[PDB]
Design a protein around this ligand. Structure first.
Ligand SMILES: [Ca+2]
Ligand SMILES: [Ca+2]
Ligand SMILES: [Ca+2]
Ligand SMILES: [Ca+2]
Ligand SMILES: [Ca+2]
Ligand SMILES: [Ca+2]
Ligand SMILES: [Ca+2]
Ligand SMILES: [Ca+2]
Ligand SMILES: [Ca+2]
Length: 301
């Protein structure tokens, strides 16, 4: 109620107080940002998101818009917009569908139905094909093994099978990589890759690059890279987003927002090590305006 007043106050009159908007949104959780959305509608009978769309613009607007969406609905929205129309940004389908957990995936499948009236998996099969469709479909099941204990005989056998399905033959037996990489738990996949390094004399990630290509290779490496160090995978994705002239603002916003309340800290510590440069320094050089002030506040203190 008090928070809803400030945003209304900061939008009232000519112009906008963008600093006040940041001081509220960046210092409030997502659960709290939903209760501010609700307190706003009751106090004034207007939607806050629409009033924010009228008085913000550009990267500031989309970063604030992302920050007010519930985490589940945001992912589901992000998946719909990645398939909407002709074309597909399979990078977005990999970043979500290959990195979210079983719990997160099942909420998306529920929210995707109850909000757009569409079948998530059905949408995936139409916008994709090949072994990538199969990989994303497995991802959509949200059915990865959850036992976090290591089964050693399984790790051995699995690696041997992965060895025989790719390197040990001409061509590749893709569904074998689909099976283990989509069914095995993350500590189990880590044991699989350790068994695969000694027997193959070449780590599992390189073999994926050799026997696979395209978005399947990207998707498969994503799962493996997440099994090793999921925060480090995002760090690399954020590094790619701001390297070069300009910024991939869609990605930089999406990763900062979606992982802000999950594992952002570990992403920063990873990013610092992999690049000898804080994630804040990279952003502060690549962004400006209030849009920068919001991004730094979210990483923050
Ligand atoms: Ca309040
Ligand atoms: Ca105004
Ligand atoms: Ca202003
Ligand atoms: Ca509080
Ligand atoms: Ca606008
Ligand atoms: Ca389409
Ligand atoms: Ca594409
Ligand atoms: Ca198809
Ligand atoms: Ca740049």
């Amino acid at each position: 109620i008090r928070d809803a007043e400030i945003l209304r106050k900061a939008m009232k009159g000519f112009g906008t107080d963008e600093q006040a908007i940041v001081d509220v949104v960046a210092n409030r959780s997502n659960d709290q940002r939903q209760k501010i959305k609700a307190a706003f509608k009751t106090s004034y009978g207007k939607d806050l998101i629409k009033d924010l769309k009228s008085e913000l613009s550009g990267n500031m607007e989309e970063l604030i818009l992302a920050l007010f969406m519930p985490p589940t609905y945001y992912d589901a929205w992000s998946l719909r917009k990645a398939m909407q129309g002709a074309g597909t940004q399979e990078r977005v389908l990999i970043e979500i569908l290959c990195t979210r957990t079983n719990q997160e995936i099942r909420e998306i499948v529920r929210c995707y139905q109850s909000e757009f009236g569409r079948d998530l998996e059905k949408d995936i099969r139409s916008d994709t094909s090949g072994h990538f469709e199969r990989l994303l479909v497995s991802m959509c099941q949200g059915n990865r093994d959850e036992n976090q204990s290591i089964n050693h005989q399984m790790a051995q056998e699995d690696a041997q099978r992965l060895y025989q399905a790719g390197e040990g033959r001409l061509g590749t037996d893709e569904s074998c990589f689909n099976m283990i990489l989509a069914t095995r738990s993350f500590p189990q996949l880590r044991a699989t890759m350790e068994a695969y390094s000694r027997m193959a004399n070449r780590d599992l990630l390189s073999s994926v690059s050799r026997e696979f290509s395209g978005y399947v290779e990207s998707g498969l490496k994503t799962i493996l890279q997440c099994a090793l160090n999921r925060p480090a995978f995002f760090a690399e994705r954020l590094y790619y987003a701001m390297k070069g002239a300009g910024t991939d603002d869609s990605t930089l916003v999406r990763i900062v927002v979606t992982r802000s309340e999950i594992d952002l800290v570990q992403i920063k510590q990873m990013f610092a090590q992999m690049y000898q440069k804080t994630l804040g320094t990279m952003i502060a050089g690549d962004t400006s305006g209030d849009y920068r002030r919001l991004l730094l506040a979210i990483v923050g203190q």
